[PDB]
Design a protein around this motif. Structure first.
Motif, PDB file in Angstrom:
ATOM      1  N   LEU A  16       0.891  -1.121   0.163  1.00 55.17           N
ATOM      2  CA  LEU A  16      -0.073   0.075  -0.003  1.00 55.17           C
ATOM      3  C   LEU A  16       0.887   1.281   0.057  1.00 55.17           C
ATOM      4  O   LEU A  16       2.125   1.268   0.432  1.00 55.17           O
ATOM      5  N   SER A  17       0.209   2.368  -0.700  1.00 58.14           N
ATOM      6  CA  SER A  17       0.953   3.808  -0.306  1.00 58.14           C
ATOM      7  C   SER A  17       0.205   4.586   0.626  1.00 58.14           C
ATOM      8  O   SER A  17       0.821   5.797   0.737  1.00 58.14           O
ATOM      9  N   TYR A  18      -0.400   4.285   1.387  1.00 56.60           N
ATOM     10  CA  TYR A  18      -1.307   5.253   1.974  1.00 56.60           C
ATOM     11  C   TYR A  18      -0.410   5.921   3.166  1.00 56.60           C
ATOM     12  O   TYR A  18       0.561   5.153   3.626  1.00 56.60           O
ATOM     13  N   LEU A  19      -0.571   7.144   3.377  1.00 52.43           N
ATOM     14  CA  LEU A  19      -0.272   7.731   4.671  1.00 52.43           C
ATOM     15  C   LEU A  19      -1.542   8.271   5.207  1.00 52.43           C
ATOM     16  O   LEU A  19      -2.324   9.237   4.638  1.00 52.43           O
ATOM     17  N   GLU A  20      -1.703   8.052   6.601  1.00 49.55           N
ATOM     18  CA  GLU A  20      -2.962   8.528   7.026  1.00 49.55           C
ATOM     19  C   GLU A  20      -2.488   8.827   8.555  1.00 49.55           C
ATOM     20  O   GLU A  20      -1.506   8.204   9.095  1.00 49.55           O
ATOM     21  N   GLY A  27     -10.261  11.745  17.644  1.00 51.17           N
ATOM     22  CA  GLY A  27     -10.709  10.595  16.784  1.00 51.17           C
ATOM     23  C   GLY A  27     -10.613  10.639  15.479  1.00 51.17           C
ATOM     24  O   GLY A  27     -11.066   9.579  14.712  1.00 51.17           O
ATOM     25  N   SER A  28     -10.214  11.800  14.940  1.00 52.82           N
ATOM     26  CA  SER A  28     -10.094  12.113  13.439  1.00 52.82           C
ATOM     27  C   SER A  28      -9.123  11.103  12.685  1.00 52.82           C
ATOM     28  O   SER A  28      -7.921  11.153  13.147  1.00 52.82           O
ATOM     29  N   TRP A  29      -9.402  10.755  11.574  1.00 55.42           N
ATOM     30  CA  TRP A  29      -8.377  10.366  10.485  1.00 55.42           C
ATOM     31  C   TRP A  29      -8.270  11.364   9.200  1.00 55.42           C
ATOM     32  O   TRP A  29      -9.262  11.917   8.869  1.00 55.42           O
ATOM     33  N   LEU A  30      -7.144  11.649   8.803  1.00 53.09           N
ATOM     34  CA  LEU A  30      -6.690  12.277   7.744  1.00 53.09           C
ATOM     35  C   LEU A  30      -5.896  11.710   6.684  1.00 53.09           C
ATOM     36  O   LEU A  30      -5.055  11.109   7.093  1.00 53.09           O
ATOM     37  N   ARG A  31      -6.304  11.650   5.344  1.00 52.08           N
ATOM     38  CA  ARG A  31      -5.303  10.965   4.311  1.00 52.08           C
ATOM     39  C   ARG A  31      -4.601  12.254   3.826  1.00 52.08           C
ATOM     40  O   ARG A  31      -4.973  13.283   3.522  1.00 52.08           O
ATOM     41  N   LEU A  32      -3.303  11.773   3.860  1.00 51.98           N
ATOM     42  CA  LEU A  32      -2.129  12.646   3.352  1.00 51.98           C
ATOM     43  C   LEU A  32      -1.529  12.195   2.133  1.00 51.98           C
ATOM     44  O   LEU A  32      -2.189  11.131   1.711  1.00 51.98           O
ATOM     45  N   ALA A  33      -0.463  13.029   1.597  1.00 46.49           N
ATOM     46  CA  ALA A  33       0.212  12.609   0.207  1.00 46.49           C
ATOM     47  C   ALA A  33       0.602  10.782   0.372  1.00 46.49           C
ATOM     48  O   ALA A  33       1.369  10.493   1.492  1.00 46.49           O
ATOM     49  N   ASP A  34       0.294   9.986  -0.508  1.00 44.68           N
ATOM     50  CA  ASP A  34       0.675   8.656  -0.795  1.00 44.68           C
ATOM     51  C   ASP A  34       2.440   8.652  -0.838  1.00 44.68           C
ATOM     52  O   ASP A  34       2.962   9.735  -1.282  1.00 44.68           O
ATOM     53  N   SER A  68      15.406  -0.752  -0.423  1.00 46.01           N
ATOM     54  CA  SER A  68      16.421  -0.074   0.332  1.00 46.01           C
ATOM     55  C   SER A  68      16.254   1.559   0.644  1.00 46.01           C
ATOM     56  O   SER A  68      17.246   2.151   0.793  1.00 46.01           O
ATOM     57  N   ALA A  69      15.043   1.789   0.125  1.00 45.37           N
ATOM     58  CA  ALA A  69      14.616   3.330   0.195  1.00 45.37           C
ATOM     59  C   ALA A  69      14.340   4.167   1.583  1.00 45.37           C
ATOM     60  O   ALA A  69      14.043   3.369   2.502  1.00 45.37           O
ATOM     61  N   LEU A  70      15.003   5.213   1.657  1.00 41.84           N
ATOM     62  CA  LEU A  70      14.577   5.942   3.018  1.00 41.84           C
ATOM     63  C   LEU A  70      13.939   7.255   2.070  1.00 41.84           C
ATOM     64  O   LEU A  70      14.522   7.891   1.440  1.00 41.84           O
ATOM     65  N   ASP A  71      12.731   7.655   2.560  1.00 46.99           N
ATOM     66  CA  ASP A  71      12.009   8.781   2.194  1.00 46.99           C
ATOM     67  C   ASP A  71      11.339   9.546   3.350  1.00 46.99           C
ATOM     68  O   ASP A  71      11.181   9.044   4.554  1.00 46.99           O
ATOM     69  N   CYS A  72      11.576  10.866   3.179  1.00 44.47           N
ATOM     70  CA  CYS A  72      11.055  11.811   4.197  1.00 44.47           C
ATOM     71  C   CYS A  72       9.703  12.535   4.151  1.00 44.47           C
ATOM     72  O   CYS A  72       9.730  13.000   2.751  1.00 44.47           O
ATOM     73  N   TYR A  73       8.965  12.496   4.893  1.00 45.36           N
ATOM     74  CA  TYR A  73       7.693  13.322   4.736  1.00 45.36           C
ATOM     75  C   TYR A  73       7.700  14.659   5.462  1.00 45.36           C
ATOM     76  O   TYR A  73       7.846  14.671   6.792  1.00 45.36           O
TER      77      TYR A  73
END
Ligand code: FB2
Length: 290
Positions: A16-20, A27-34, A68-73
């Motif tokens: 999956l690519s989800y970032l939430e 109690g809220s959920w927010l969908r953010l950039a994949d 092997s990836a490192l990615d920064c949000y």
């Protein structure tokens, strides 16, 4: 801490690519950039208020690729940026942060089960290998307490493990600690107060609901109250003195369940559900985005 519990990636049918982001205050959920690349079996961590996604594997219709990836949000921009990649792909990785540096521990690359460990310096955007663990570990839980790094459980290529070890940075040395009372691959591992907690996982036969904690002063593991749901490949984090476990697999369902542990009452409760069931997520806590 910060404000939100971020869950990145995971697995349901494929990676999956989800970032939430879940907000315990409402109690809220927010969908953010994949994520730019789907991944399961990754780890999450935070340094300097940035969220990092480390390792994993993209299990997809068109092929399976260990990362092997490192990615920064950056929550300020809602954008992912690639960082330098690790020396090796590491699926079912564990990570810990000490003194603003990210330690990537173990994981797999195809049938290679790693004992190797490397350290990322955000100010240099560079990885460097350190001393390897004494045991190969994938599905390994990692936590940091008092600027020491703990690697807990996992799978060595042949056996699921109850063993655990500690890395002493100033000696560049790993040493065994007391083993857990339960064999666990894919447990959730975190720190709370003076203890390393290991929640859930897989013992070779069954997904586990049991939870145990290692007191660094006494060098013993003690069981606390079990989770309401058996689960392996769960995400875990700490937020305002409580442990949160997110998803995982129970032998039947990919769970959407999120449970919260209150150490003063020694009780678990269900606090929310993820927007969809998944296992093998990366989880960490930082400030809310814009
Ligand atoms: N990371 S995952 O896809 O949940 C996974 C967990 C355990 C074994 C293999 C894969």
């Amino acid at each position: 801490v910060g404000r939100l519990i971020y869950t990145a990636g995971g697995y349901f049918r494929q990676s999956l690519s989800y970032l939430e982001a879940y907000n315990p205050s409402n109690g809220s959920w927010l969908r953010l950039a994949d994520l730019q690349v789907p991944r399961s079996g990754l780890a999450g961590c935070v340094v300097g208020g940035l969220l990092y996604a480390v390792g994993g594997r993209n299990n997809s219709p068109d092929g399976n690729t260990d990362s092997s990836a490192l990615d920064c949000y950056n929550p300020m921009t809602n954008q992912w940026s690639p960082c330098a990649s690790m020396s090796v792909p590491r699926n079912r990785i564990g990570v810990g942060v000490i003194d603003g540096h990210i330690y990537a521990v173990g994981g797999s690359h195809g049938c290679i089960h790693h004992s190797s460990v490397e350290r990322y310096e955000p100010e240099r955007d560079e990885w460097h290998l350190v001393a390897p663990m004494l045991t190969r570990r994938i599905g390994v839980g990692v936590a940091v307490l008092n600027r020491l790094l703990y690697a807990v459980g996992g799978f060595d290529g042949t056996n699921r493990l109850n063993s655990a070890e500690c890395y002493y940075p100033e000696r560049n040395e790993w040493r065994m600690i007391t083993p857990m009372n339960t064999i666990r691959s894919g447990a959730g591992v975190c720190v709370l107060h003076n203890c390393i907690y290991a929640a859930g996982g897989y013992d070779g036969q069954d997904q586990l609901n049991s939870v145990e904690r290692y007191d660094v002063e006494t060098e013993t593991w003690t069981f606390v109250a079990p989770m309401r749901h058996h689960r392996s490949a769960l995400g875990i984090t700490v937020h305002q003195g409580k442990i949160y476990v997110l998803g995982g697999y129970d032998g039947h369902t990919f769970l959407d369940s999120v449970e919260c542990y209150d150490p003063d009452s020694d009780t678990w409760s269900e606090v929310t559900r993820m927007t969809s069931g998944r296992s093998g997520v990366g989880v960490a806590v930082t400030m809310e985005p814009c």
